[model samples]
Target: EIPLDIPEDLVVSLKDTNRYYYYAGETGPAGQAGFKDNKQSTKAKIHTSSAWFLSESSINYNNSRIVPVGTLGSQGFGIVLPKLPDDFQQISSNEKPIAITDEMRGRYLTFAARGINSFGRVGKYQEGPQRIWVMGLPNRGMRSNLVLHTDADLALMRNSDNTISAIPADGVAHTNTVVANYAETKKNGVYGAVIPVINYKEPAINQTRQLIALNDSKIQFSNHDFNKGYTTSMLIGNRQQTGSLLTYKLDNSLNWTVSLEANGKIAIETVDNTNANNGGRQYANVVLDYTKDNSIQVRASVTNKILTLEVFVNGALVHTHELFMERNGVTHDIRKSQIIFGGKTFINEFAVYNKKLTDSEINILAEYFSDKYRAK
Candidate 1:
């Protein structure tokens, strides 16, 4: 379960694909993190500042330990900075454990994910923002530089002259109308709902690079969480292009370039996790020679003035055929059925062919494509 700290009173709700961009699910009233009925900001500005913390449950820290700066540590919270400036220094972060106290309320703080696992904690904390008082460090020294929520949805920052400003985020945020308190549900975002996670993978506070646009708008991926399969993409036309236009987020929080091989076929590889000794950590290899083995695929075809298409998921005969017809000098493509392919299926990747393919090519794509699938 992901820990989402947004307050019910504070968040605006939305629905369906619209919900995919903003939130993971319905957030309960934030009683734990000092969230109250402050008037919501209609204009895009840093109305509030927030941070995702690993809770105490997930990480165990002794009351005594040498914690360092920029460490992703235990205990965290959110704050609405009194005032902030755009073109401000990039967001930055530091970590050190501190003694909890009453006077520390309202000032922003950070917590690890362990303590934030339950709604009780979320609600409890929203009642009051978690603040801490450290014994040795001066209050000024304890001020952790905040990473501004620079995107358009929750934009917050003022330019040097103090005019409110917002950086545009590519996607929209969304919520659900069918269910209440759904964020607690496992992997709740099945239908385009978005769940914002604490980015442990981002660079230290106040420093974030602009998100790169792949294919101009077809696909977008960040540098962080690429391996974990975090990515955003739009359906695009078929063609082998230079480098994958899809973005790749690097583990170090720096975004990386993604490109596709020109005129190259898609490749499918598998992971080997037979033994327990090595934590079953596995690697991938692409099948350069597609002419030799089982490669599954989906393909488009047209014959005798009739258009036909089919899909196979993991070698199973999942989708038989779909037909688009031409009648009386008229043509129609009506999509009435669907076959969802799991990305994990092992299959041969196919090339995007510009010309209409022959039956042999379609069979070739299906055989290798059936071996597995990449999000069709």
Candidate 2:
């Protein structure tokens, strides 16, 4: 009598997980047909048997057509085989048959561990994983998993209700080729889903070396050297606050206090020092006026030079002066205000001088900054 359960090892290439089984070269078009546990009216049947066989397999039966010699040379000339299309079967022609691998008993299991439905193809990402756990000698039923599995470490099969289940099995049943579960047939004498394998090993590389090689590669910088402002770290010109207009001294040695006072005055607002340079020079005279119901006026000037450098606000010239030094009506508006230069040192002057700086002057300033490679 047949053993209560066929031994898995008896099968040739049965796997524990869902797998695809390819037909032998004798039956159908070379690698053209396949058998899967997929949900179709025809249970993994041939798409077109007529197309699978060659003229030799076709014979005449008194004006009728029959699959002549179909089974005559079934094992050789007209053999049909099965195989998976993608990774669903977890089986490949690459891996040798584990007649009775250490993992499973001599019995091979080629049942529908999982199958895809039309809905699964469309709403897979949102619907989650669907596994099928089969039972019986020729496994045919299936189960489902409603939850989405995140960890890929373990292999999970589906239950009757389309849910995931972690069930153990006797290795021997898994390899039986004659087992109803063709997908997991171990003794079928072929490779198919009967094997559940994960190619975790990295391709063409020693996985362990990856982490070691990426450990010591990062840029280094010093914080202490950045905070201490020596002659190497200094700013010039001025720093314009919201309402306070104060021209800064280029000479780094100048003792100064940049502050905002509550009164109409700026400068050393918190100190009672009688310093001579405290009567700061106006940096930018900006005004927030509604010219077009929602427009503003920003004016500025600089005249520590020989020419009388004037500035304006909303077409109104507010700054007109002359000094015998190095200064000019520099224009910096909403469009251009970034200060980036050689290692350290931005533009020497900045202001919103309009006729004070004409279109021609604006073009010249643009060219100057461009020449300095700081136009961007």
* Model 2: per-residue Cα lDDT over 217-315, one tens digit each: 211111211011111111111112122222222222222222222231223211112321222445324432211111111212333322233333323
User: What CA RMSD would you report for each candidate?
Assistant: 22.8, 30.5
In angstroms, the error of model 2 at 338 is 11
Per-residue lDDT for 291 in model 2? 16
- Clash count of each predicted structure: 78, 64
lDDT of 2: 0.22
Best by lDDT: 1
lDDT to native, each model: 0.25, 0.22
Cα error of candidate 2 at position 86, Å:
48
